[PDB]
Structure 1
Amino acid sequence: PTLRWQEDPEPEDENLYEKNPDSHGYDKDPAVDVWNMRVVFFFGFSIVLVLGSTFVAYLPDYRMQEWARREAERLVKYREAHGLPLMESNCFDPSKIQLPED
């Protein structure tokens, strides 16, 4: 003797196929679906993906790397040529220091 509602039995399986089996993924307008194919398969894969791959394939020396290679080569050549030990410790001057004495 009671229902508590009024609404209709909804929805149905509105298949995106059974109308346009040539069509691509999204909704029922069969021109702008081809336009979406064009925009996401030219602007996601053609102009962005391989261009970004060639951009990251070579960009300048990120974090100064090849500069560091050649500078280390020249500095180790220096410290071979002058006979002093390469990479002396105490990077700061051992004289320029003030220890808090007792």
Structure 2
Amino acid sequence: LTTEDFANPSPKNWQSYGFDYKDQVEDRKATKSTFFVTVTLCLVWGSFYWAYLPDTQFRNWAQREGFLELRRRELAGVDLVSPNYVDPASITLPSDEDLGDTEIII
């Protein structure tokens, strides 16, 4: 080889990309389409779709309801977090003779 070949390289001699080692046409389609369906679609358009996703898990609504329940409970004498799951008058409270020897767990 001579210095005229290296100074003016050949179009027909092509360094192959990683996809297809048989045809130059098959690389220049596979790189473009694989970069389109991964980088443009999944990582940019998919990230844009996720950025403007609605409250599928209720977190912003739970924050709004947290402000509203702190607004109403500070107005009345009811405490800010209820200690009990339901009202204790609805609790049946079975007697000690009815329980006998039963495991009570706190």
Runs of 4+ in 1 over 3 A off after TM superposition: 19-22
What does 1:1-102 align with in structure 2 at a 5 Å threshold?
20-25=13-18, 26-101=20-95, 102=97
Distance 2:32 2:89 in 1: 70
Counterpart AA for 1:24: Y
* Paired letter, 1:64: F
Percent identity, aligned pairs only? 38
Question: Which amino acid in structure 2 is aligned with residue 58 of structure 1?
Answer: Y
Structure with more helix by fraction: 2
> One-letter code of the match for 1:77?
R
Letter in 2 for 1:73: F
- Residues 74 and 80 of structure 2 are in contact (CA less than 8 Å); yes or no, is this contact kept in structure 1? yes
Cα distance in 2, alignment partners of residues 37 and 52 from structure 1:
20
Which secondary structure state, in structure 2, belongs to the residue aligned with residue 70 of structure 1? Answer: helix
> What is the CA-CA distance between 1:50 and the residue it aligns to?
0.3
Going from structure 1 to structure 2, the CA distance change for 1:99 and 1:84 (only over 3 Å counts) comes to closer
- State TM-score, norm by structure 1: 0.71
5+ long unaligned stretches in structure 2: 1-11, 98-106
Normalising by structure 2, report the TM-score: 0.69
